[PDB]
Swiss-Prot record:
Its EC number is 3.4.23.22. One of its GO terms (biological process) is proteolysis. It is an enzyme of class 3 (hydrolase). The chain holds residues 90 to 419 of 419 of the full protein. It comes from Cryphonectria parasitica. The active site is at 35, 199. Residues 17-328 form the Peptidase A1 domain. This is Endothiapepsin. It catalyses: Hydrolysis of proteins with specificity similar to that of pepsin A, prefers hydrophobic residues at P1 and P1', but does not cleave 14-Ala-|-Leu-15 in the B chain of insulin or Z-Glu-Tyr. Clots milk. Belongs to the peptidase A1 family. GO terms for molecular function: aspartic-type endopeptidase activity.
Length: 330
């Protein structure tokens, strides 16, 4: 089997991407944030504290003839941005772009933190990291990809995120029309539960490539590109007036600037992020200070190849017995 679904930016900055997902019988369609940096499929629901719902579409398990309470199971997750959610668990039928999993754990939110409530466009998350990170207790549950894998034509999914435009998540096949050149594959460590790999270096604009190993994670659920402070300083030093602002929380730059590109290495191959992809717009409405899309990871503990980087590539998440990642230009 295969599946193919369009993913759409939630706003004019590509702050996140939503993908329609069918849950239950008859189908209830929710727009979920596909997140290769986490491993829980959770949704706003009829159980979510009413004051914490503000415009999201909710899953109502009592209206699904295939929903079953997973007795005793609870979940609770905290994300790197400080947001969180928790609740109980149902199993139900879940379909993405024509690919159907029966018995998928659907984690129903009883509580969500303010940033979720405040984002009316995201109805929940669909985790695509390794199932060892799933938070369900006392019986850990599998991701949608893990449950579908055996049925797929090939045990892979691909992320093709757009810049200011829709893109595609495919399951079970590699669309050879969606990228240019060849796909370069690189090793993955699953020891932390992430799609963790080592970039071979970087360049700023037309500058020379610096060969240096950068361990990080391919994370579709993180907006920006988080890299070591040395790398980030070298980038912003090429932008007149750019500075790190403790009060804003990162590097800012004059909105009048033209940003240089940023290149990262994948083995001997190179992915080029155009300068425009690094502009996240005014820090507050009407400001002439703009927020940068490349930020320091120094306070995180891990480097993160978020959407800013991934949207410049066609990315293969290869879930073969020894997983690997593939990157192509497009």
């Amino acid at each position: 089997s295969t599946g193919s679904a369009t993913t759409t930016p939630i706003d004019s900055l590509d702050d996140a991407y939503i993908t329609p997902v069918q849950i239950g019988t008859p189908a209830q369609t929710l727009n979920l944030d596909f997140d290769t940096g986490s491993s829980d499929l959770w949704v706003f629901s009829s159980e979510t504290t009413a004051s914490e719902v503000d415009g999201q579409t909710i899953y109502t398990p009592s209206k699904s003839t295939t929903a079953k309470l997973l007795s005793g199971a609870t979940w609770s997750i905290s994300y790197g941005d400080g947001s969180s959610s928790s609740g109980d668990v149902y199993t139900d039928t879940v379909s993405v772009g024509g690919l159907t999993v029966t018995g998928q754990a659907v984690e129903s939110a009883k509580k969500v933190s303010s940033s979720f409530t405040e984002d009316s466009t995201i109805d929940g998350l669909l985790g695509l990291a390794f199932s060892t990170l799933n938070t369900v207790s006392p019986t850990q549950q599998k991701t949608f990809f893990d449950n579908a894998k055996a049925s797929l034509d090939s045990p892979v999914f691909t992320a093709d995120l757009g810049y200011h435009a829709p893109g595609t998540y495919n399951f079970g096949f590699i669309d050879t029309t969606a990228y240019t050149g060849s796909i370069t594959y690189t090793a993955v460590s699953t020891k932390q539960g992430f799609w963790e790999w080592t970039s071979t270096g970087y360049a700023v604009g037309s500058g020379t490539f610096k060969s240096t190993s950068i361990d990080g994670i391919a994370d579709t659920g993180t907006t920006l590109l988080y890299l070591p402070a040395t790398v980030v300083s070298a980038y912003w030093a090429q932008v007149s007036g750019a500075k790190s602002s403790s009060s804003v929380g990162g590097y800012v730059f004059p909105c009048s600037a033209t940003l240089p590109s940023f290149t990262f290495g994948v083995g001997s191959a190179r992915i080029v992020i155009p300068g425009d992809y690094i502009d996240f717009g005014p820090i507050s409405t009407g400001s002439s200070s703009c927020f940068g899309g490349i930020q320091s990871s120094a306070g995180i503990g891990i480097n993160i190849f978020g959407d800013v980087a991934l949207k410049a590539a066609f990315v293969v998440f290869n879930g073969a017995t020894t997983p690997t990642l593939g990157f192509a230009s497009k």
